[PDB]
Amino acid sequence: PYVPVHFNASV
Amino acid sequence: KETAAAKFERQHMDSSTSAASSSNYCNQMMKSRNLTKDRCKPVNTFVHESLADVQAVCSQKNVACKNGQTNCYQSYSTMSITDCRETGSSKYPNCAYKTTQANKHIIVACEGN
């Protein structure tokens, strides 16, 4: 369990 | 008080809707998630998928991040998502946002939290 820490980009 | 993981959830997770409401979704949501308390965060994306579906992206397609780091992953499939962005005519503390709904592959940065 590595979890999302940043929302880098879309598609 | 705020771990990088909860920050992430607070800012981008909205599993309570399959897609953006109407044109005011960004106004309420940015407000709600307290992304406009001191200032108007200029850009923020909401993911309309379950928490688990999004966590699962960290074991998907590994790609370089836009900076060069190696801890970025791309979702195999598209996800319903909402792009919230400040309209040229937005000033604190009366933050206006243009909500843009889409279906896209999200790229997230992962770490062990």
CATH code, domain with B19: 3.10.130.10
Question: Whole-angstrom distance between the N-terminal and C-terminal Cα of chain A?
Answer: 23
- Tell me, in Å, the resolution of the deposited structure: 2.0
Q: How many CA atoms lie within 13 A of B94 on its CB side?
A: 1
Q: What is the signed CA dihedral for B3, B4, B10, B11, rounded to 10 degrees?
A: 150
| Beta-bridge mates of residue B100 | B83
Put simply, the answer to whether A5 touches B47 (Cβ < 8 Å) is: no
| Count: domains in chain B | 1
Question: What is the residue type of A7?
Answer: F
Its domain, for residue B77, covers 1-113
What is the phi/psi pair of residue B9, to 5°? Answer: -70, -45
B105 is catalytic: no
Put simply, the answer to whether B110 touches A5 (Cβ < 8 Å) is: yes
Q: Is B83 on the interface with A (CB under 8 A)?
A: yes
- The token duo for B11 is 């800012």
- Residues with Cβ within 8 Å of B49's Cβ and at least 6 positions away in sequence, in order, are B15, B79, B80
Q: How far is CA B18 from CA B50, B64, B80, in A?
A: 10, 29, 7
